[PDB]
Amino acid sequence: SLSMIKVRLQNLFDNDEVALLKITCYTDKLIHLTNALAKAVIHTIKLNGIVFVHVITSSDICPNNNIVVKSNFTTMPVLQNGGYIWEMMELTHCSQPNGLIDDNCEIKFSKKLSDSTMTNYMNQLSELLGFDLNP
Ligand SMILES: [Cl-]
Ligand SMILES: [Cl-]
């Protein structure tokens, strides 16, 4: 009853920096996870061993954080402490969802903010980076 997804990512401020996000969830929740990620901005925070992955989605259903059974975040190179925003380059559904995964990050789902200050921030950032964060 478990499914596994891996998402390949590249840093919008430095395309040489890449990351892999692996998530396991119950198969009946998989559709909510993929729909959420399809309409999502990916923002991460790192302070030493503590890593937070923010999935900020414009999907109709923003899933509950409890749909994640395990999550792993690995980067190349190893990143300095700080905050990051990522482009999703690839999404893969994996055979053998029960395989080993080192649980080393916390996933936080939230809804995109309709507030005009945040909208203006996301639109100007989109123009700076040449990538539409608010399509
Ligand atoms: Cl949707
Ligand atoms: Cl602003």
Side-chain angles (χ1 to χ4, degrees), residues 1-95 97-135:
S1 67
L2 286 177
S3 304
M4 180 179 279
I5 55 179
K6 60 176 57 162
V7 183
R8 201 158 53 74
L9 302 164
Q10 77 170 19
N11 178 357
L12 285 162
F13 281 91
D14 185 349
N15 296 353
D16 300 333
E17 301 186 326
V18 298
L20 186 59
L21 175 62
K22 184 170 275 191
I23 305 171
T24 60
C25 69
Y26 288 108
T27 304
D28 56 358
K29 303 292 188 189
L30 182 60
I31 194 59
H32 303 297
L33 180 51
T34 51
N35 287 343
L37 287 166
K39 285 167 174 172
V41 169
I42 310 297
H43 163 55
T44 59
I45 292 158
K46 175 176 179 285
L47 182 67
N48 307 316
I50 302 161
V51 178
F52 290 106
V53 179
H54 291 270
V55 178
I56 302 139
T57 192
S58 61
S59 186
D60 290 340
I61 304 165
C62 177
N64 193 301
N65 293 342
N66 71 18
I67 69 159
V68 174
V69 176
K70 298 206 186 212
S71 55
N72 178 277
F73 193 72
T74 307
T75 73
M76 192 181 71
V78 174
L79 303 171
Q80 82 167 39
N81 294 332
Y84 296 89
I85 192 171
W86 303 88
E87 187 180 342
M88 285 171 56
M89 301 308 285
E90 187 168 286
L91 193 155
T92 299
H93 295 261
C94 301
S95 168
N98 296 282
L100 183 62
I101 165 165
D102 180 38
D103 183 74
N104 74 345
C105 65
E106 196 181 317
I107 299 193
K108 304 282 210 181
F109 295 98
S110 68
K111 275 295 296 295
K112 189 192 83 85
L113 305 185
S114 60
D115 174 275
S116 65
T117 306
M118 182 57 83
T119 303
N120 287 333
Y121 178 85
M122 290 310 209
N123 287 345
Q124 289 187 64
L125 197 57
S126 295
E127 203 81 342
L128 177 63
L129 302 167
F131 178 78
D132 202 354
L133 298 168
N134 191 21

